[PDB]
Design a protein around this ligand. Structure first.
Ligand SMILES: Cc1cc2nc3c(=O)[nH]c(=O)nc-3n(C[C@H](O)[C@H](O)[C@H](O)COP(=O)(O)OP(=O)(O)OC[C@H]3O[C@@H](n4cnc5c(N)ncnc54)[C@H](O)[C@@H]3O)c2cc1C
Length: 383
């Protein structure tokens, strides 16, 4: 009577879905395309709406680990291309630390996890669903696809007409260990900062902004350069460029003497080159026979100014687990549809807020788990 779940894509969404489905008594098999945990990523934020899910894991020990691994920022100093301008309930953390924490916990639960598994084929019958991996068919009661913004699962389940759309902005970024910076005289302004506390710096130019911060109490450095680029050809999170590209962008900046060493000391002189993307609302996240669902960035990428990508990935994973538990093995199709309907409007409202900012308590104060328990039978009846 145990529900068998396949999860594709072990980012934040897939790892939360794996942990939560396992906690709800389902049998999880999870698949990740990379050959090992890659430890790649930018700082993102985790808010209280996600923290309510996380703190229930292992009596708060995962929350504690995330808190220890955060960027312990006191203030944000905002400068312009020459000089100072401004000084200013979620916490900032490097994505690589968060997914590593999530993964080590997930694997410690005994969950069947398989790397080196690039999934493109999805299938379903009235009674089962599954995928093809390494030429072989893997079957289960349902499939949760959390393979990210460049989702191949979305192609299979929803179609390939709706695609992530460029915004016109692109980002160069990297992160590395502080020891790579210490000793460079052009960086003492950042490396000799108050200890036990992380700093965040915004440098605001004409259609160019540079972010520079530290994480884990000065153990890590990160930097990013957002600029307008209509013809950037980046198609993935691991597209690289020479750090020269970002230094060129600020070449006439007065603060260049401060910023150039941060970019130049990036290991191997390579940064990531990313588009800032949006995507239309999908008509449905759910397969024709209601046994497969896309969640996370695969379903609802958010503009980075919302800071909700990781949060809503976590809310997605917690919700679908409850929906499967409440529906049961015999009504898996109902649970999948209920999970979609529970989440569809909320994520859409967040996406629209991002566009409105591009030119609130209703997000942070929401408890997705209690919501799903409260609303399931109502929404099941509508389905
Ligand atoms: C390497 C990487 C770097 C990122 N860098 C940034 C960044 O700098 N800034 C930012 O705002 N967001 C970044 N993100 C996205 C960010 O994690 C998300 O916005 C959000 O926090 C979590 O979304 P998600 O879990 O749904 O998807 P993701 O975190 O993107 O995870 C999706 C996972 O699915 C895997 N996958 C993809 N295709 C397949 C396939 N065919 N078969 C199997 N597995 C597959 C990927 O390897 C990945 O582990 C990055 C994601 C990744 C994977």
């Amino acid at each position: 009577q145990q529900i068998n779940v396949i999860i594709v894509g072990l980012g934040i969404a897939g790892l939360t879905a794996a942990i939560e489905c396992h906690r709800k008594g389902h049998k999880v098999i999870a698949f990740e395309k990379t050959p090992k945990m890659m430890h790649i990523g930018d700082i993102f934020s985790i808010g209280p709406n996600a923290e309510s899910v996380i703190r229930q894991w292992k009596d708060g020990a995962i929350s504690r680990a995330l808190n220890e691994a955060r960027c312990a920022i006191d203030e944000i100093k905002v400068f312009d291309e020459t000089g100072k301008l401004q000084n200013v309930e979620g916490y900032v953390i490097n994505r690589a630390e968060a997914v590593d924490i999530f993964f080590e916990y997930a694997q410690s639960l005994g969950i069947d996890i398989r790397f080196n598994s690039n999934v493109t084929e999805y299938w379903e019958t009235p009674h089962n669903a599954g995928i093809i991996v390494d030429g072989l068919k893997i079957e289960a009661d349902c499939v949760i696809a959390t393979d990210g913004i460049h989702s191949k699962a979305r192609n299979a389940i929803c179609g390939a007409v709706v695609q992530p759309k460029k915004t016109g902005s692109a980002i160069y970024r990297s992160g590395y260990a502080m020891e790579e910076l210490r000793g460079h005289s052009g960086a003492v302004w950042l490396t000799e900062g108050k200890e036990d506390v992380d700093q965040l710096y915004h440098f605001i130019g004409k259609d160019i902004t540079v972010l520079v911060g530290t994480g884990r109490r000065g153990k890590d450095v990160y930097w990013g350069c957002m600029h307008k680029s209509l013809h950037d050809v980046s198609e993935s999170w691991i597209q690289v460029s020479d750090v020269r590209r970002a230094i060129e962008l600020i070449s006439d900046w007065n603060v260049r003497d401060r910023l150039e060493p941060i970019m130049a000391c990036t290991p191997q002189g390579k940064c990531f080159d990313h588009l800032v993307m949006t995507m239309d609302q999908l008509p449905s996240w759910v397969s024709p026979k209601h046994r497969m669902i896309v969640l996370g960035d695969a379903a609802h990428p958010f503009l980075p100014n919302t800071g909700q990508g990781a949060n809503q990935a976590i809310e997605d994973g917690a919700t679908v687990a409850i929906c499967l538990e409440l529906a049961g093995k015999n009504q898996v199709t109902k649970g999948v549809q209920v999970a979609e309907r529970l989440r569809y409007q909320r994520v859409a409202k967040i996406q629209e807020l991002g566009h409105r900012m591009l030119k609130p308590a209703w997000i942070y104060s929401h408890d997705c788990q209690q919501y799903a328990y409260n609303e399931f039978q109502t929404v099941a009846q509508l389905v």
